Amino acid sequence: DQSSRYVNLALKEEDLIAGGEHVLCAYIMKPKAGYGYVATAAHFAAESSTGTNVEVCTTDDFTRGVDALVYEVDEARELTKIAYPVALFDRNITDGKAMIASFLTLTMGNNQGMGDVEYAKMHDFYVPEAYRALFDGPSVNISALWKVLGRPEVDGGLVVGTIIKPKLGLRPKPFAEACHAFWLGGDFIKNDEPQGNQPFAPLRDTIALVADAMRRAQDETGEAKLFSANITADDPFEIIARGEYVLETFGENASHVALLVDGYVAGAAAITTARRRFPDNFLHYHRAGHGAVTSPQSKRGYTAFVHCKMARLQGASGIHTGTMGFGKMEGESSDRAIAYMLTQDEAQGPFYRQSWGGMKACTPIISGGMNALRMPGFFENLGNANVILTAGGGAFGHIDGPVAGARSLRQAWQAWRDGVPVLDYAREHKELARAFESFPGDADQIYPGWRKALGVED
Amino acid sequence: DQSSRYVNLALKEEDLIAGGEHVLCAYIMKPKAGYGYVATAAHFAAESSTGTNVEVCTTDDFTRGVDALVYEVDEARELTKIAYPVALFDRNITDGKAMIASFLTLTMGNNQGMGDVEYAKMHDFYVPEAYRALFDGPSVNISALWKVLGRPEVDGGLVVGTIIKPKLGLRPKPFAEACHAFWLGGDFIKNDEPQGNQPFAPLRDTIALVADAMRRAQDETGEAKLFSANITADDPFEIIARGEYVLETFGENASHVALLVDGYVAGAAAITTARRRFPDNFLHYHRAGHGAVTSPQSKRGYTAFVHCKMARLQGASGIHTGTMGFGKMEGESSDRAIAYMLTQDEAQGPFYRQSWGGMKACTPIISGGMNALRMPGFFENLGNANVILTAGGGAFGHIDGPVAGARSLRQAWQAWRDGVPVLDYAREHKELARAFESFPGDADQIYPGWRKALGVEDT
Ligand SMILES: O=C(COP(=O)(O)O)[C@H](O)[C@H](O)COP(=O)(O)O
Ligand SMILES: O=C(COP(=O)(O)O)[C@H](O)[C@H](O)COP(=O)(O)O
Ligand SMILES: [Mg+2]
Ligand SMILES: [Mg+2]
């Protein structure tokens, strides 16, 4: 059974890329107990391409041309790469452009539950030039945010943010005054994933009061501020009535708002509403239950790599990354390339080198309780400091709390940009130097015998 | 974080159910090793509700009466059951309605990655009368489809259909041509999931031709044909534009066009577009890729039960429920269980009972095929026959060609309905008689002694 039509292991991998007619894919799939690797590969190509359940030829002439082909396999590492003709893709009748829906439908649809396949995790795709340019892409990225913070649009550095504690629980005013309280030291305020229009903290009235406390905090600080308004809806016209609300209530302050969409749990149409309708605004892609299917444990679906890479194409200005709250204490691996794939114009994915031809970076939105002492070092490995940061541990960790934690963090960046070594810079700006007094065991190994040098104990 | 405050192991479940201010959720959650069960559940209860990472506040002190509780655990069986107050769920600034997206961020959220939990899968949800009442609901079902086939709205029966095969290839006349010819047996066609505008076979023509083909078949048969057209796009305005091209091209027989949206690979806003812009047509929700969560090789997400229950609330006209397709010792994501939650105004799930308060229903959309002879035994374990059968002409494997298959299997349901044992029907209806010849494998064993009484000679 199943074929020898959907396999051609002689096709050169590079000759394919260069030709530019196919989208390639790279999965780790182990067939259920008993089945052939090849037969299982071609089945899966078959269930993602053309079908024709059992038997014969049917009308024929071209079905047998636009056939997805398996061009390479490793049974031992469990490596299937499948090459999908570009004609199979589905473009709008509206404006002729690609749609992630289809890319997903084909490459990880009825594939994820099908026949002789027992787990299949897509680990990387390659898009040709005739298909890459049908894609939307980010409209904006941290440059329009640097641009609002009066920084230089090329290498502007780090935006310091927070998520207001608590998550849910704050009435409008207190909410609005806990927004005040951090704009006074940091530049960005988020809105946790769920906040919108609860009965006990309505959207209309909270967003009026935040807009306000934006103006007072701008005023006392001289410095511009940035807010992310969660406009996640099911109905795509509430999504619009939220965003149009929020942006016209911010008035003149409208450029300072970033639109939050949790595009994992509402779908590529919440996100394609945000973008397409508000292309000017920063489309913050908060994730969520990305772990249903992207966790290392789940052996089916796709990896985080693939979640972020698709995002660039959809058109997300920024997307969460870095996963801390534990996460290191044994050596880890290979989702480092998330970074250069999101921002560089030509990079090496895990199987394929991608080329985005002038298609805008989407920025790493970083998270965790990484405090200003850990940071100097993270900006070195990555190499630049061009990411939005959202904290909890570094802000709330500092002993003088909120405004100071935030101040210690913009202070750990300057030291890095300006080439001056943290320990020294500690000496001058209290906030930074009290960052070391804040997180002790983090102090004594990053910056050994800091004590003597900072002005205290030995 | 904590334990305390986020635990009230003493809150009786039915007290929680009787009042109705809380959404109840059931999960199969196992802590990573060293971690200590109730503590961890509290820490799950906090990452899905109020947060409260210590000295952070609601200053006046205490506004934790919007705090999600742990009301039950069974450490061995890994059962974490949680209570979500209702004020937490996001409503809408324009109409008042709740949203599956909110529902979905408060439960199906950031617990799906949390570092001190190895997995957690939702098994069921209770969704009360004040929250359930804010929520789309199906605005039509199998009964709008039945009313155009020319049948009664109540206890009204089986709609049979196919999937055009091959799934992709065929430039436009061939795909039209393949529709018409199936439209001489069967009722309903749907394009496969990857179909819209492939350059080789484009929506604009490919749909005009389909509509042309529709009227050829409804001349020559006297009876009505249904089409389920795939109008799935990333952009709502595209979703709508495709969608209004189809109902205007099909025009005079625009009420026979079901609307297909791929529901997993495009989320809720894709579903919500059709649901509200085309309230008037079948919203077919075809669940592609669900497998990544639901398929039981996966321990994180929701199950097929949960995926179909909330798709009801949202507004699918009919969803591809599955197939009975089993053997021996049941449970482990039942076709009956689900079916019963999607149709029945007051069903029971694996933990909770729910009272849909006058919704409407989302028709199970069964797929596989138990040809002619096996069918009425499908209809028995169910207890009705009001679904749609989409089959791979496996179900329509017939000496006479798949024209007699769709009629053979249509015949088996008329038979069941009216209720005169399949066999006495086969003398009377040929494709049924011949439906036996095609299937000696069942049509002997599954339908008793037919040789003597029916269809001819041979051994
Ligand atoms: O709840 C938080 C808090 O921690 P923090 O203080 O770092 O904001 C965040 O919303 C996500 O957990 C992290 O986002 P990501 O999806 O990028 O991991
Ligand atoms: O392409 C097919 C194979 O068809 P068949 O099963 O008839 O051979 C099916 O339509 C869907 O993949 C499953 O749909 P469902 O939600 O009903 O499982
Ligand atoms: Mg959060
Ligand atoms: Mg199908």
Domain boundaries, chain A: 4-135, 136-438
Which residues share a beta bridge with A353?
A348
Residues in chain A: 458
What topology does CATH give the domain B4-135? Alpha-Beta Plaits (3.30.70)
Q: Which residues of B are annotated as a binding site?
A: 110, 167, 190, 192-193, 287, 320, 367
Breaks after residues in chain B, judged by C–N over 2.5 Å: none
Q: What's the CA gap between B324 and A439, in Å, rounded? A: 58
Phi, psi for A307 (deg, rounded to 5)? -55, -50
Q: How far is A155 from chain B (nearest CA, A)?
A: 31
Phi, psi for B401 (deg, rounded to 5)? 90, 150
User: Closest-CA residue in chain A for B94?
Assistant: A238
Interhelix angle A236-249/A268-277, nearest 10 degrees: 40
Cβ of B58 closer than 6 Å to ligand 1, yes or no, is: no
B118 contacts chain A (CB < 8 A)? yes
Count other C-beta atoms under 10 Å from residue B57's C-beta.
16
Closest C-alpha residue for ligand 1 atom 15: A320
With CA atoms as reference, report the closest residue to B321 among B330, B332, B329, B311.
B311
Cβ of B391 closer than 6 Å to ligand 2, yes or no, is: yes
A300 contacts chain B (CB < 8 A)? yes
Q: What's the CA gap between B106 and B67, in Å, rounded? A: 12
**A96-131: string of b/e by CB count within 10 Å (b at 16+)?**
eebbbbbbbbbbbbbbbbbbbbbbbbbbbbbbbeeb
DSSP state at residue B12 = -
Q: What's the CA gap between A114 and A46, in Å, rounded? A: 11
| Residues of B that are catalytic | 165, 286
Cβ-contact B365, B284 below 8 angstroms: yes
Dihedral of alpha carbons A370, A339, A84, A32, sign: negative
Dist. CA B336 → ligand 2 center (Å): 18
Give resolution in angstroms: 2.6
Cβ of A321 closer than 6 Å to ligand 1, yes or no, is: yes
Structure tokens at B325: 């397709």
First to last CA, chain B: 74
CATH of B136-438, one of 2.30.30.230, 3.40.190.10, 2.70.98.30, 3.20.20.110: 3.20.20.110
Cβ of A110 closer than 6 Å to ligand 2, yes or no, is: yes
Breaks after residues in chain A, judged by C–N over 2.5 Å: none
Phi, psi for B177 (deg, rounded to 5)? -55, -45
Closest C-alpha residue for ligand 2 atom 1: B192
With CA atoms as reference, report the closest residue to A296 among B122, B107, B28, B115.
B115
Count other C-beta atoms under 10 Å from residue A18's C-beta.
9
Element holding A81 (H helix, E strand): strand A79-85
B268 contacts chain A (CB < 8 A)? yes
Phi, psi for B390 (deg, rounded to 5)? -115, 125
Place of tokens 């560089």: A344
With CA atoms as reference, report the closest residue to B406 among B418, B423, B385, B391.
B391
A111 contacts chain B (CB < 8 A)? yes
Q: What's the CA gap between A72 and A15, in Å, rounded? A: 13
Please tell me the number of the ligand nearest to residue B230's CA.
4
Cβ-contact B82, B31 below 8 angstroms: no
With CA atoms as reference, report the closest residue to B113 among B52, B44, B56, B167.
B44
Residues in chain B: 459
Annotation-wise, does A190 bind a ligand?
A: yes
Q: What's the CA gap between B434 and B438, in Å, rounded? A: 6
